[PDB]
Amino acid sequence: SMEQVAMELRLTELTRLLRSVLDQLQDKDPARIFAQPVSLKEVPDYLDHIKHPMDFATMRKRLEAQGYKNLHEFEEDFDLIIDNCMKYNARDTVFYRAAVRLRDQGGVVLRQARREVDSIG
Incomplete structure (x- = not known):
């Protein structure tokens, strides 16, 4: 349907905006501390502590599959x-x-991104 297409174009445009957001956030991490998953080989106890590990590479995988709906x-x-x-x-x-x-x-970055997502729809 054309309605499903339109919804897909909105998801695509959100994805574009989130890609730019992600680049801007990641530039605030020049040491690259958050670039990749914590290695369970090097911090073997990590998942005893942290239940939902997250990192910028993992977010980028999800983003590229258009996996963020909002x-x-x-x-x-x-x-x-x-x-x-x-x-x-x-x-x-x-x-x-x-x-x-x-x-x-x-x-800073997220504050304006919310305005843009509301503004553009």
């Missing part, structure tokens, strides 16, 4: 990145501090 879903995954790190790592660590800085800078 901004809320994409924000959920970005928040997992930050929140998982802040739980596993102590306040005095480069990892924790990197996550605080990512959260603060990412807030």
Whole structure:
């Protein structure tokens, strides 16, 4: 149907916007602390701590399959990145501090992305 096509074009355009959002958030992580999954070979206890691991590569896989239906879903995954790190790592660590800085800078980007998603529909 043409209605199903139109819904698919909206999903595609959301995907475009989320791709740009993801690039902008990831530039706020120049150390690349959040680029890839935590390795269970190198942190064998991780899944005892963290139930839903998340990272930028994993988000990019989901995005490219048009797997985010709305901004809320994409924000959920970005928040997992930050929140998982802040739980596993102590306040005095480069990892924790990197996550605080990512959260603060990412807030800026997400605030305007919400306006754009509401505005364009």
